[PDB]
Amino acid sequence: ILYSDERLNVTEEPTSNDKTRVLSIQCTLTEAKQVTWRAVWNGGGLYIELPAGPLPEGSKDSFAALLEFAEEQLRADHVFICFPKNREDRAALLRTFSFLGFEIVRPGHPLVPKRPDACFMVYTLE
């Protein structure tokens, strides 16, 4: 099931009556920016994973908007945003998002704890 709203179209891909699920959110260049996003649903919170998307050349107001909509429907709060470290982008990203009151953490895999260089952020009903 996929619906399209104001320049935003999402497709929900559930799996069984348990466990996590997979969802895709596509945002159009409403403000001159179009990117394909990938988000996985984990429990009562939304998860955002950036496999390979244009980090730079994007505003911050757009991100906040998509966050408000998703939270409305899902009615959740625990939203996480994880993206790589291209060059000059994560700085301002936290500068604004910090207005919410999230926590900064880094990924740690049993094989490769730190190396991929992926900034992970986790926030909940503040």
Coordinates of all heavy atoms in Angstrom, one line a residue, residues 40-126:
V40 N 13.2 1.9 7.9 CA 12.7 0.6 8.4 C 11.9 0.9 9.7 O 12.4 1.7 10.6 CB 13.8 -0.4 8.7 CG1 14.5 -0.7 7.4 CG2 14.8 0.2 9.7
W41 N 10.8 0.2 9.9 CA 10.0 0.3 11.1 C 10.4 -0.6 12.2 O 10.5 -1.8 11.9 CB 8.5 0.1 10.7 CG 7.6 0.4 11.8 CD1 6.6 -0.5 12.4 CD2 7.4 1.6 12.5 NE1 5.9 0.1 13.4 CE2 6.4 1.4 13.5 CE3 8.0 2.9 12.4 CZ2 6.0 2.5 14.3 CZ3 7.6 3.9 13.3 CH2 6.6 3.7 14.2
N42 N 10.8 -0.1 13.3 CA 11.2 -0.9 14.4 C 10.4 -0.6 15.7 O 10.6 0.4 16.3 CB 12.7 -0.6 14.7 CG 13.4 -1.7 15.4 OD1 14.0 -2.6 14.8 ND2 13.3 -1.7 16.8
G43 N 9.5 -1.5 16.0 CA 8.7 -1.4 17.1 C 7.7 -0.2 17.1 O 7.1 0.1 16.0
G44 N 7.7 0.6 18.1 CA 6.8 1.8 18.2 C 7.5 3.0 17.7 O 7.1 4.1 18.0
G45 N 8.7 2.9 17.1 CA 9.5 4.0 16.6 C 9.9 3.9 15.2 O 10.0 2.8 14.6
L46 N 10.1 5.0 14.5 CA 10.6 5.1 13.1 C 12.1 5.1 13.0 O 12.8 5.8 13.8 CB 10.0 6.3 12.5 CG 10.0 6.2 10.9 CD1 9.0 5.2 10.4 CD2 9.6 7.6 10.3
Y47 N 12.6 4.3 12.1 CA 14.0 4.2 11.9 C 14.4 4.7 10.5 O 13.7 4.4 9.5 CB 14.5 2.8 12.0 CG 15.9 2.7 12.5 CD1 16.2 2.0 13.7 CD2 17.0 3.2 11.8 CE1 17.5 1.9 14.2 CE2 18.3 3.1 12.2 CZ 18.6 2.5 13.4 OH 19.9 2.4 13.8
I48 N 15.4 5.5 10.4 CA 15.9 6.1 9.1 C 17.3 5.7 8.8 O 18.2 6.0 9.6 CB 15.8 7.6 9.1 CG1 14.4 8.1 9.6 CG2 16.1 8.1 7.7 CD1 14.3 9.6 9.7
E49 N 17.5 5.0 7.7 CA 18.8 4.5 7.3 C 19.2 5.0 5.9 O 18.4 4.8 4.9 CB 18.9 3.0 7.3 CG 20.3 2.5 7.2 CD 20.4 1.3 6.3 OE1 20.1 0.1 6.7 OE2 20.8 1.4 5.1
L50 N 20.3 5.8 5.8 CA 20.8 6.3 4.5 C 21.8 5.4 3.9 O 23.0 5.5 4.2 CB 21.3 7.7 4.7 CG 20.3 8.8 4.5 CD1 19.5 9.0 5.8 CD2 20.9 10.1 4.1
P51 N 21.4 4.5 3.0 CA 22.4 3.6 2.3 C 23.3 4.3 1.4 O 24.5 4.1 1.3 CB 21.5 2.6 1.5 CG 20.2 3.4 1.3 CD 20.1 4.3 2.5
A52 N 22.8 5.3 0.6 CA 23.6 6.1 -0.4 C 22.7 7.1 -1.0 O 22.3 7.0 -2.1 CB 24.2 5.1 -1.4
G53 N 22.6 8.3 -0.3 CA 21.8 9.4 -0.8 C 22.5 10.7 -0.7 O 23.3 10.9 0.2
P54 N 22.3 11.6 -1.7 CA 22.9 12.9 -1.7 C 22.8 13.7 -0.4 O 21.8 14.4 -0.1 CB 22.2 13.7 -2.8 CG 21.7 12.6 -3.7 CD 21.3 11.5 -2.8
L55 N 23.8 13.5 0.5 CA 23.8 14.2 1.8 C 23.7 15.7 1.7 O 22.8 16.3 2.1 CB 25.0 13.8 2.6 CG 24.8 12.6 3.6 CD1 23.9 13.0 4.7 CD2 24.3 11.4 2.9
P56 N 24.7 16.3 1.0 CA 24.8 17.7 0.8 C 23.7 18.2 -0.2 O 22.9 17.4 -0.7 CB 26.2 18.0 0.3 CG 26.6 16.7 -0.4 CD 25.9 15.6 0.4
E57 N 23.7 19.5 -0.5 CA 22.8 20.1 -1.5 C 21.3 19.9 -1.0 O 20.4 19.8 -1.8 CB 23.0 19.4 -2.8 CG 24.0 20.2 -3.7 CD 24.5 19.3 -4.8 OE1 23.9 18.2 -5.1 OE2 25.6 19.6 -5.3
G58 N 21.2 19.9 0.3 CA 19.8 19.7 0.9 C 19.6 20.6 2.1 O 20.5 20.8 2.9
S59 N 18.4 21.1 2.3 CA 18.1 22.0 3.4 C 17.7 21.2 4.6 O 17.6 19.9 4.5 CB 16.9 22.9 3.0 OG 17.3 24.0 2.2
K60 N 17.5 21.8 5.7 CA 17.2 21.2 7.0 C 15.7 21.2 7.3 O 15.1 20.4 7.9 CB 18.0 21.8 8.2 CG 19.5 22.0 7.8 CD 19.7 23.4 7.4 CE 20.8 23.5 6.3 NZ 20.7 24.8 5.5
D61 N 15.1 22.3 6.8 CA 13.7 22.5 7.0 C 12.9 21.4 6.4 O 11.8 21.0 6.9 CB 13.2 23.9 6.4 CG 11.8 24.2 6.8 OD1 11.4 23.8 7.9 OD2 11.1 24.9 6.0
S62 N 13.4 20.9 5.3 CA 12.7 19.8 4.6 C 12.6 18.5 5.4 O 11.6 17.9 5.5 CB 13.4 19.5 3.2 OG 14.8 19.3 3.4
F63 N 13.8 18.2 6.1 CA 13.9 17.1 6.9 C 12.9 17.1 8.1 O 12.2 16.2 8.4 CB 15.3 16.9 7.5 CG 15.7 15.5 7.6 CD1 17.0 15.1 7.1 CD2 14.9 14.5 8.1 CE1 17.4 13.8 7.2 CE2 15.3 13.2 8.2 CZ 16.6 12.8 7.8
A64 N 12.8 18.3 8.7 CA 11.9 18.5 9.9 C 10.5 18.3 9.5 O 9.7 17.8 10.2 CB 12.1 19.9 10.4
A65 N 10.1 18.7 8.2 CA 8.8 18.6 7.7 C 8.4 17.1 7.6 O 7.3 16.7 8.1 CB 8.7 19.3 6.4
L66 N 9.2 16.3 6.9 CA 8.9 14.9 6.8 C 8.8 14.2 8.1 O 8.1 13.2 8.2 CB 10.0 14.3 5.9 CG 9.8 14.3 4.4 CD1 10.4 15.6 3.8 CD2 10.5 13.1 3.7
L67 N 9.5 14.7 9.1 CA 9.5 14.1 10.4 C 8.2 14.4 11.1 O 7.7 13.5 11.9 CB 10.6 14.7 11.3 CG 10.7 14.2 12.7 CD1 11.3 12.8 12.8 CD2 11.4 15.2 13.6
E68 N 7.6 15.6 10.9 CA 6.3 15.9 11.5 C 5.2 15.1 10.9 O 4.3 14.6 11.6 CB 6.0 17.4 11.3 CG 6.7 18.3 12.3 CD 7.3 19.6 11.7 OE1 6.5 20.4 11.2 OE2 8.5 19.7 11.6
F69 N 5.2 14.9 9.6 CA 4.1 14.1 8.9 C 4.2 12.7 9.4 O 3.1 12.2 9.8 CB 4.3 14.2 7.4 CG 3.3 15.1 6.7 CD1 3.7 16.4 6.4 CD2 2.1 14.7 6.4 CE1 2.7 17.3 5.8 CE2 1.1 15.5 5.8 CZ 1.5 16.8 5.5
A70 N 5.3 12.0 9.3 CA 5.5 10.6 9.6 C 5.0 10.4 11.1 O 4.3 9.4 11.4 CB 6.9 10.2 9.5
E71 N 5.4 11.3 12.0 CA 5.0 11.2 13.4 C 3.5 11.3 13.6 O 2.9 10.7 14.4 CB 5.7 12.3 14.2 CG 5.4 12.2 15.7 CD 5.2 13.6 16.3 OE1 5.8 14.5 15.8 OE2 4.4 13.6 17.3
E72 N 2.9 12.1 12.7 CA 1.4 12.3 12.8 C 0.7 11.0 12.5 O -0.1 10.5 13.4 CB 1.0 13.4 11.8 CG -0.2 14.2 12.3 CD -1.2 14.5 11.2 OE1 -0.9 15.4 10.3 OE2 -2.3 13.9 11.2
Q73 N 0.9 10.4 11.4 CA 0.2 9.2 11.0 C 0.6 8.1 12.0 O -0.3 7.5 12.7 CB 0.6 8.8 9.6 CG -0.5 9.1 8.5 CD 0.1 9.8 7.3 OE1 1.2 9.5 6.8 NE2 -0.7 10.8 6.8
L74 N 1.9 7.7 12.0 CA 2.4 6.7 12.9 C 2.1 7.0 14.3 O 1.9 6.1 15.1 CB 3.9 6.5 12.7 CG 4.3 5.4 11.6 CD1 5.8 5.3 11.5 CD2 3.6 4.1 11.9
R75 N 2.0 8.3 14.7 CA 1.7 8.7 16.0 C 2.9 8.3 17.0 O 2.7 8.3 18.2 CB 0.4 8.1 16.5 CG -0.7 9.1 16.5 CD -2.0 8.5 16.0 NE -2.5 9.0 14.8 CZ -3.7 8.8 14.2 NH1 -4.6 8.0 14.9 NH2 -4.1 9.3 13.1
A76 N 4.0 7.9 16.4 CA 5.2 7.5 17.2 C 6.0 8.7 17.6 O 5.6 9.9 17.4 CB 6.0 6.5 16.4
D77 N 7.2 8.5 18.2 CA 8.1 9.5 18.6 C 9.5 9.2 18.4 O 10.3 9.9 17.8 CB 7.8 9.9 20.1 CG 7.2 11.3 20.2 OD1 7.8 12.3 19.9 OD2 6.0 11.3 20.7
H78 N 9.9 8.0 18.9 CA 11.3 7.5 18.8 C 11.7 7.5 17.4 O 11.6 6.5 16.7 CB 11.4 6.1 19.4 CG 10.7 5.9 20.7 ND1 10.4 4.7 21.2 CD2 10.2 6.8 21.6 CE1 9.7 4.8 22.4 NE2 9.6 6.1 22.6
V79 N 12.3 8.6 16.9 CA 12.8 8.7 15.5 C 14.3 8.7 15.5 O 14.9 9.5 16.3 CB 12.2 10.0 14.9 CG1 12.7 10.0 13.4 CG2 10.7 10.0 15.0
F80 N 14.9 7.9 14.7 CA 16.3 7.9 14.6 C 16.8 8.2 13.1 O 16.2 7.8 12.2 CB 16.9 6.5 14.9 CG 15.9 5.7 15.8 CD1 15.2 4.6 15.3 CD2 15.7 6.1 17.1 CE1 14.4 3.9 16.1 CE2 14.8 5.3 17.9 CZ 14.2 4.2 17.4
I81 N 17.9 9.0 13.0 CA 18.4 9.3 11.7 C 19.9 9.0 11.7 O 20.7 9.4 12.5 CB 18.3 10.8 11.5 CG1 18.8 11.6 12.7 CG2 16.8 11.2 11.2 CD1 18.7 13.1 12.5
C82 N 20.3 8.1 10.7 CA 21.6 7.7 10.6 C 22.1 7.9 9.1 O 21.5 7.3 8.2 CB 21.8 6.2 11.0 SG 23.4 5.5 10.6
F83 N 23.2 8.6 9.0 CA 23.8 8.9 7.6 C 25.3 8.9 7.7 O 25.9 9.1 8.7 CB 23.3 10.3 7.1 CG 23.6 11.4 8.0 CD1 24.6 12.3 7.6 CD2 23.0 11.6 9.2 CE1 25.0 13.4 8.4 CE2 23.4 12.7 10.0 CZ 24.4 13.6 9.6
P84 N 25.9 8.7 6.5 CA 27.4 8.6 6.5 C 28.0 10.0 6.7 O 27.3 10.9 7.2 CB 27.7 8.2 5.0 CG 26.4 8.5 4.3 CD 25.3 8.4 5.2
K85 N 29.3 10.1 6.4 CA 30.0 11.4 6.6 C 30.8 11.8 5.4 O 32.0 11.7 5.3 CB 31.0 11.2 7.8 CG 31.2 12.5 8.6 CD 32.6 12.7 9.2 CE 32.6 13.2 10.6 NZ 33.7 14.2 10.8
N86 N 30.0 12.3 4.4 CA 30.6 12.8 3.2 C 31.6 13.9 3.4 O 32.8 13.7 3.4 CB 29.5 13.3 2.2 CG 29.0 12.2 1.3 OD1 29.4 11.0 1.4 ND2 28.0 12.5 0.4
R87 N 31.1 15.1 3.6 CA 32.0 16.3 3.9 C 31.2 17.5 4.1 O 30.5 18.0 3.2 CB 32.9 16.5 2.7 CG 32.2 16.5 1.3 CD 33.2 16.3 0.2 NE 33.6 17.6 -0.4 CZ 34.7 17.8 -1.2 NH1 35.4 16.7 -1.4 NH2 34.9 19.0 -1.6
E88 N 31.2 18.0 5.3 CA 30.5 19.2 5.7 C 29.0 19.0 5.5 O 28.5 19.3 4.4 CB 31.0 20.4 4.9 CG 30.7 21.8 5.6 CD 31.9 22.2 6.5 OE1 33.1 22.0 6.1 OE2 31.7 22.7 7.6
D89 N 28.3 18.6 6.5 CA 26.8 18.4 6.4 C 26.3 17.9 7.8 O 25.2 18.4 8.2 CB 26.5 17.3 5.4 CG 25.0 17.2 5.1 OD1 24.2 17.6 6.0 OD2 24.7 16.7 4.0
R90 N 27.0 17.0 8.4 CA 26.5 16.4 9.7 C 26.6 17.5 10.8 O 25.8 17.5 11.7 CB 27.4 15.3 10.1 CG 28.9 15.6 10.1 CD 29.4 15.8 11.5 NE 30.5 16.8 11.5 CZ 31.3 17.0 12.5 NH1 31.2 16.2 13.6 NH2 32.2 17.9 12.5
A91 N 27.5 18.5 10.6 CA 27.7 19.5 11.6 C 26.4 20.3 11.7 O 25.8 20.4 12.8 CB 28.8 20.5 11.1
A92 N 26.0 21.0 10.6 CA 24.8 21.8 10.7 C 23.5 21.0 11.0 O 22.6 21.4 11.5 CB 24.6 22.5 9.3
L93 N 23.6 19.7 10.5 CA 22.5 18.8 10.8 C 22.1 18.7 12.2 O 21.0 18.8 12.6 CB 22.8 17.4 10.2 CG 21.7 16.6 9.6 CD1 20.5 16.5 10.6 CD2 21.2 17.3 8.3
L94 N 23.2 18.5 13.1 CA 23.0 18.4 14.5 C 22.7 19.7 15.1 O 22.0 19.8 16.1 CB 24.2 17.7 15.2 CG 24.3 16.2 15.1 CD1 25.0 15.8 13.7 CD2 25.1 15.7 16.2
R95 N 23.2 20.8 14.5 CA 23.0 22.1 15.0 C 21.5 22.5 15.1 O 21.0 23.1 16.1 CB 23.7 23.1 14.1 CG 24.1 24.4 14.9 CD 25.4 25.0 14.3 NE 26.5 24.0 14.3 CZ 27.2 23.6 15.3 NH1 26.9 24.1 16.5 NH2 28.1 22.7 15.2
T96 N 20.8 22.1 14.1 CA 19.3 22.4 14.0 C 18.5 21.3 14.8 O 17.8 21.6 15.7 CB 18.9 22.4 12.6 OG1 19.2 21.2 11.9 CG2 19.5 23.6 11.8
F97 N 18.7 20.0 14.4 CA 18.0 18.9 15.0 C 18.2 18.9 16.5 O 17.3 18.4 17.2 CB 18.5 17.6 14.4 CG 17.5 16.7 13.9 CD1 17.4 16.5 12.5 CD2 16.5 16.1 14.7 CE1 16.4 15.7 12.0 CE2 15.5 15.3 14.2 CZ 15.5 15.1 12.8
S98 N 19.3 19.5 17.0 CA 19.5 19.6 18.4 C 18.4 20.4 19.1 O 18.2 20.2 20.3 CB 20.9 20.4 18.6 OG 21.0 20.8 20.0
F99 N 17.7 21.2 18.4 CA 16.6 22.0 19.0 C 15.5 21.0 19.6 O 14.8 21.5 20.5 CB 15.9 22.8 17.9 CG 14.9 22.1 17.0 CD1 13.7 22.7 16.7 CD2 15.3 20.9 16.5 CE1 12.8 22.0 15.9 CE2 14.4 20.2 15.7 CZ 13.2 20.8 15.3
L100 N 15.5 19.8 19.2 CA 14.6 18.8 19.7 C 15.0 18.3 21.0 O 14.3 18.3 22.0 CB 14.4 17.7 18.7 CG 12.9 17.1 18.6 CD1 12.6 16.7 17.2 CD2 12.8 15.9 19.6
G101 N 16.3 17.8 21.1 CA 16.8 17.2 22.3 C 17.2 15.8 22.2 O 16.8 15.0 23.1
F102 N 17.8 15.4 21.1 CA 18.2 14.0 20.9 C 19.5 13.7 21.4 O 20.2 14.6 22.0 CB 18.1 13.7 19.4 CG 19.2 14.4 18.6 CD1 20.4 13.7 18.2 CD2 19.1 15.7 18.2 CE1 21.4 14.3 17.5 CE2 20.1 16.3 17.4 CZ 21.2 15.6 17.1
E103 N 20.0 12.5 21.3 CA 21.3 12.0 21.8 C 22.2 11.5 20.6 O 21.7 10.8 19.7 CB 21.2 11.0 22.8 CG 20.6 9.7 22.3 CD 20.8 8.5 23.3 OE1 21.9 8.4 23.9 OE2 19.9 7.6 23.4
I104 N 23.4 11.9 20.6 CA 24.4 11.5 19.6 C 25.1 10.2 20.0 O 25.7 10.1 21.0 CB 25.4 12.6 19.3 CG1 26.0 13.1 20.5 CG2 24.7 13.7 18.5 CD1 27.2 14.0 20.3
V105 N 25.1 9.2 19.1 CA 25.7 7.9 19.3 C 26.3 7.4 18.0 O 25.9 7.8 16.9 CB 24.8 6.9 19.9 CG1 25.5 5.7 20.4 CG2 23.9 7.5 21.1
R106 N 27.3 6.5 18.2 CA 27.9 5.9 17.0 C 27.6 4.4 16.9 O 27.4 3.7 18.0 CB 29.4 6.1 17.1 CG 29.9 7.2 16.2 CD 30.7 8.2 17.0 NE 30.0 9.4 17.3 CZ 30.5 10.6 17.7 NH1 31.9 10.7 17.9 NH2 29.8 11.6 18.0
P107 N 27.6 3.8 15.7 CA 27.3 2.4 15.5 C 28.4 1.5 16.0 O 29.6 1.9 16.0 CB 27.1 2.2 14.0 CG 27.9 3.4 13.5 CD 27.8 4.5 14.5
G108 N 28.1 0.3 16.5 CA 29.1 -0.7 16.9 C 28.7 -2.1 16.6 O 28.0 -2.7 17.4
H109 N 29.3 -2.6 15.5 CA 29.0 -4.0 15.1 C 30.0 -4.9 15.7 O 31.2 -4.6 15.9 CB 29.1 -4.1 13.6 CG 28.2 -5.1 13.0 ND1 28.6 -6.4 12.6 CD2 26.8 -5.1 12.8 CE1 27.6 -7.1 12.1 NE2 26.5 -6.4 12.3
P110 N 29.6 -6.2 16.1 CA 30.5 -7.2 16.7 C 31.8 -7.4 15.9 O 32.8 -7.8 16.4 CB 29.6 -8.4 16.7 CG 28.2 -8.0 16.6 CD 28.2 -6.7 15.9
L111 N 31.7 -7.2 14.6 CA 32.9 -7.3 13.7 C 33.6 -6.0 13.5 O 34.8 -5.9 13.7 CB 32.4 -7.9 12.3 CG 32.3 -9.4 12.3 CD1 31.3 -9.8 11.3 CD2 33.7 -10.0 11.9
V112 N 32.8 -5.0 13.1 CA 33.4 -3.7 12.9 C 32.7 -2.6 13.7 O 31.8 -1.9 13.2 CB 33.4 -3.3 11.4 CG1 31.9 -3.3 10.9 CG2 34.0 -1.9 11.1
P113 N 33.1 -2.4 15.0 CA 32.5 -1.4 15.9 C 32.5 0.0 15.3 O 31.5 0.5 15.1 CB 33.4 -1.5 17.1 CG 34.0 -2.9 17.1 CD 34.2 -3.2 15.6
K114 N 33.7 0.5 15.0 CA 33.8 1.8 14.5 C 34.8 1.8 13.3 O 35.9 1.4 13.4 CB 34.3 2.8 15.5 CG 33.3 3.1 16.6 CD 34.0 3.2 18.0 CE 34.2 4.6 18.4 NZ 34.8 4.8 19.7
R115 N 34.3 2.3 12.1 CA 35.1 2.4 10.9 C 34.3 3.0 9.7 O 34.7 3.9 9.1 CB 35.7 1.0 10.6 CG 37.2 1.0 10.3 CD 37.7 -0.4 10.6 NE 39.2 -0.4 10.7 CZ 40.0 -1.5 10.5 NH1 39.4 -2.7 10.3 NH2 41.3 -1.4 10.6
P116 N 33.1 2.4 9.5 CA 32.3 2.8 8.4 C 32.0 4.3 8.4 O 31.7 5.0 7.4 CB 31.0 2.1 8.6 CG 31.4 0.8 9.3 CD 32.6 1.2 10.2
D117 N 32.1 4.9 9.6 CA 31.9 6.3 9.8 C 30.4 6.7 9.5 O 30.2 7.4 8.5 CB 32.8 7.2 8.9 CG 34.1 7.6 9.6 OD1 34.0 8.6 10.3 OD2 35.1 6.9 9.5
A118 N 29.6 6.3 10.4 CA 28.1 6.5 10.2 C 27.6 7.1 11.5 O 27.6 6.5 12.6 CB 27.4 5.3 9.8
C119 N 27.2 8.4 11.4 CA 26.6 9.1 12.6 C 25.2 8.7 12.8 O 24.3 8.8 12.0 CB 26.7 10.6 12.3 SG 28.3 11.3 12.9
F120 N 24.9 8.1 14.0 CA 23.6 7.7 14.4 C 23.0 8.5 15.5 O 23.7 8.9 16.4 CB 23.6 6.2 14.8 CG 22.4 5.7 15.5 CD1 21.3 5.2 14.8 CD2 22.2 5.8 16.9 CE1 20.2 4.8 15.4 CE2 21.1 5.4 17.5 CZ 20.0 4.9 16.8
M121 N 21.8 8.9 15.4 CA 21.1 9.7 16.3 C 19.8 9.1 16.8 O 19.0 8.6 15.9 CB 20.8 11.1 15.8 CG 22.1 11.8 15.3 SD 22.7 11.3 13.7 CE 23.7 12.7 13.3
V122 N 19.5 9.1 18.1 CA 18.3 8.5 18.6 C 17.5 9.5 19.5 O 18.1 10.0 20.5 CB 18.5 7.2 19.4 CG1 19.4 7.5 20.5 CG2 17.2 6.6 19.8
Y123 N 16.2 9.7 19.2 CA 15.4 10.6 20.0 C 14.0 10.0 20.2 O 13.6 9.1 19.5 CB 15.2 12.0 19.3 CG 15.4 12.0 17.8 CD1 14.4 12.3 16.9 CD2 16.7 11.7 17.3 CE1 14.6 12.3 15.6 CE2 16.9 11.6 15.9 CZ 15.8 11.9 15.0 OH 16.0 11.9 13.7
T124 N 13.4 10.5 21.3 CA 12.0 9.9 21.6 C 11.1 11.1 22.1 O 11.5 12.2 22.1 CB 12.2 8.9 22.8 OG1 12.8 9.5 23.9 CG2 12.9 7.7 22.3
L125 N 9.9 10.7 22.4 CA 8.9 11.7 22.9 C 9.5 12.6 23.9 O 9.5 12.3 25.1 CB 7.7 11.0 23.5 CG 7.9 9.6 24.1 CD1 9.0 9.7 25.1 CD2 6.6 9.1 24.7
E126 N 9.9 13.8 23.4 CA 10.5 14.8 24.3 C 9.4 15.7 24.9 O 8.2 15.5 24.6 CB 11.5 15.6 23.5 CG 12.8 14.9 23.1 CD 14.0 15.2 24.0 OE1 14.3 16.4 24.2 OE2 14.6 14.3 24.6

